Amino acid sequence: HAPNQALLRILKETEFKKIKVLGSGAFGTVYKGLWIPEGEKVKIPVAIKELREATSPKANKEILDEAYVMASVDNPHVCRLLGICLTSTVQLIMQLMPFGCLLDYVREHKDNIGSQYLLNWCVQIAKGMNYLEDRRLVHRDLAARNVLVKTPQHVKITDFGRAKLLGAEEKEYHAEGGKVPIKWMALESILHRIYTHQSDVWSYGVTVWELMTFGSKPYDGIPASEISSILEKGERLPQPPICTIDVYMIMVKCWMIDADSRPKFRELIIEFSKMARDPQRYLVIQGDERMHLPMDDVVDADEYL
Numbered sequence: 001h002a003p004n005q006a007l008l009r010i011l012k013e014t015e016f017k018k019i020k021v022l023g024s025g026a027f028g029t030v031y032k033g034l035w036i037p038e039g040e041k042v043k044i045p046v047a048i049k050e051l052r053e054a055t056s057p058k059a060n061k062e063i064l065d066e067a068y069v070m071a072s073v074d075n076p077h078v079c080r081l082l083g084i085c086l087t088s089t090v091q092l093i094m095q096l097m098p099f100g101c102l103l104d105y106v107r108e109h110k111d112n113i114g115s116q117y118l119l120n121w122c123v124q125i126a127k128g129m130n131y132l133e134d135r136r137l138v139h140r141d142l143a144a145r146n147v148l149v150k151t152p153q154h155v156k157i158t159d160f161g162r163a164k165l166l167g168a169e170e171k172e173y174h175a176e177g178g179k180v181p182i183k184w185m186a187l188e189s190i191l192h193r194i195y196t197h198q199s200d201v202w203s204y205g206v207t208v209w210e211l212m213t214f215g216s217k218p219y220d221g222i223p224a225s226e227i228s229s230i231l232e233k234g235e236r237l238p239q240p241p242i243c244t245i246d247v248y249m250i251m252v253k254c255w256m257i258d259a260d261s262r263p264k265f266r267e268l269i270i271e272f273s274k275m276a277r278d279p280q281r282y283l284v285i286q287g288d289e290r291m292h293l294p295m296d297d298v299v300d301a302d303e304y305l
């Protein structure tokens with residue numbers, strides 16, 4: 001394994017301005033804002049998380065470990081961390097993704113989402129996931145809520161709170177146990193707390209199904225404790241109405257019990273790209289052809305290098 005020479009940038013608090021609240025979680029408030037590096041005539045749209053003073057040493061430690069992961073990744077389909085700021089409580093500064101999480105976005109805009117967008121997002125997520133595999137990173141929480149929308153044409157994978165870097169000799173990760181997203185997890189993760197890139201593939205399949213059903217909840221009837229035996233009996237999520245068998249067979253392959261029988265991300269890239277070239281052959285959406293979707297020194301983070 002190579003030396004990780006990623007730079008962690010520590011920002012001065014006067015360098016960035018909070019403009020409005022985007023949301024608030026358990027660990028603090030997230031603000032829309034602008035980052036104005038001193039002496040560079042540039043303004044960068046950012047999201048800024050200000051951790052609560054209530055935050056434990058334990059929580060702080062785990063948040064910084066997540067920032068370490070985010071600072072180590074550099075791909076157009078993985079979230080961009082700009083830096084952190086070491087004030088009274090720690091602040092994390094990331095690229096603004098103005099359209100929010102992809103799960104909300106498909107629920108809220110389902111009447112205007114065509115086959116071209118759906119297939120392109122599958123490609124993009126596969127590209128980010130492939131890159132994470134190249135980095136020997138196992139995500140462990142892939143899901144539509146954990147994909148952000150920069151523009152309708154460009155999504156990025158986020159939330160590395162569960163991510164684990166594999167060791168050089170290491171093949172699988174073994175977790176300790178706790179609050180787990182059971183309905184997105186490979187069977188071997190539920191049963192034996194084993195996680196691989198192939199288990200991320202399973203999660204990818206569920207994420208695709210979320211997208212193809214415009215944000216339905218997987219196994220909506222069923223409680224989490226029942227999931228693993230349902231899977232052991234060979235039952236899977238149903239074929240979404242818009243999906244040709246071509247697309248559904250792909251999701252199904254992602255949910256093979258034998259992890260090595262699942263597709264690789266680089267193959268998912270290939271197969272969804274083929275379909276993105278003729279999208280109406282692969283997803284059947286009523287009115288598809290009808291559909292389309294959307295101070296001075298402003299630059300996107302992607303162009304600030």
Ligand SMILES: CC(C)(O)CC(=O)NCCn1ccc2ncnc(Nc3ccc(Oc4cccc(C(F)(F)F)c4)c(Cl)c3)c21
Pocket residue numbers: 022023024025026027030047048049063066067092093094095096097098099100101148161
């Ligand atoms: C909580 C919540 C507010 O309920 C959910 C939520 O975070 N979503 C906010 C909504 N949101 C909308 C556009 C948008 N664009 C970009 N980043 C967003 N969110 C965002 C997320 C995490 C960020 O930072 C980190 C980095 C690592 C670890 C942690 C952790 F929470 F564990 F402490 C935070 C930042 Cl700076 C922003 C955005």
